[PDB]
Curated annotation (Swiss-Prot):
Quaternary state and interactors: DNA polymerase alpha:primase is a four subunit enzyme complex, which is assembled throughout the cell cycle, and consists of the two DNA polymerase subunits A POL1 and B POL12, and the DNA primase large PRI2 and small PRI1 subunits. Interacts with MCM10.
Chain sites annotated for binding [4Fe-4S] cluster: C21, C102, C119, C159
Protein name as annotated: DNA primase large subunit
Function recorded in the entry: DNA primase is the polymerase that synthesizes small RNA primers for the Okazaki fragments made during discontinuous DNA replication. In a complex with DNA polymerase alpha (DNA polymerase alpha:primase) constitutes a replicative polymerase. Both primase components participate in formation of the active center, but the ATP-binding site is exclusively located on p48.
Stated family: Belongs to the eukaryotic-type primase large subunit family.
Shown segment, full-protein numbering: 316 to 512 of 528
Length: 183
């Protein structure tokens, strides 16, 4: 828990290593104090894969869902705690829940209104992507290249370009490669 824990996953240092899909899920969680089912699964299993423990996950999800008075702890415990415990096998299930790779993410139903799961290189408009990439200090030529990959449907190449420009396809590999470059 020394490095990855319920508090450090909200730090700029750790979160600077997240790929765009995880950044988007964390932003939706931060703003709405909730994620719908597919996003809960994508984000909770990514965090499990980076080493967020069972206890630290339950802290993280209970604090994020009850933040700013969004729901009572009693409602969280009645309507969500089981689901997050299940993702960690804490009620005894033996389903093999592994972190989702990019192909798996892309193959989930596309996000609609109110959804934050998916792959932003496919799911965001070019304008929204451009604004986000400018926030990450990319220049116009860089953004044009990333958008070229997006328009060709080469979403994991677009994501690889963003990794290279800001420093098998799998969000957890993006995180691990990025985190290693901080050490
Ligand atoms: S390419 Fe994969 S890691 Fe990158 S944003 Fe899309 S789903 Fe996430």
């Amino acid at each position: 828990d020394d490095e990855i824990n319920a508090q450090s996953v909200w730090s700029e240092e750790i979160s600077s290593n997240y790929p765009l899909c995880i950044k988007n899920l964390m932003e939706g969680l931060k703003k709405n104090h909730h994620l719908r089912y597919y996003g809960r699964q994508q984000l909770s299993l990514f965090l499990k894969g980076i080493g967020l423990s069972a206890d630290e996950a339950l802290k993280f999800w209970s604090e994020a869902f009850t933040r700013n008075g969004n729901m009572t702890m009693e409602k969280f415990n009645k309507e969500y705690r089981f689901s997050f415990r299940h993702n960690y096998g804490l009620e005894g299930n033996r389903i093999n829940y592994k972190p989702w790779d990019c192909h798996t993410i892309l193959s989930k139903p596309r996000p609609g209104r109110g959804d934050y799961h998916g792959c932003p290189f496919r799911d965001w408009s070019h304008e929204r992507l451009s604004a986000e990439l400018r926030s990450m200090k990319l220049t116009q030529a860089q953004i044009i290249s990333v958008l070229d990959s997006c328009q060709k449907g080469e979403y994991t190449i677009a994501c690889t370009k963003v990794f290279e420009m800001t420093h098998i396809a799998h969000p957890n590999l993006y995180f691990e490669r990025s985190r290693q470059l901080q050490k």
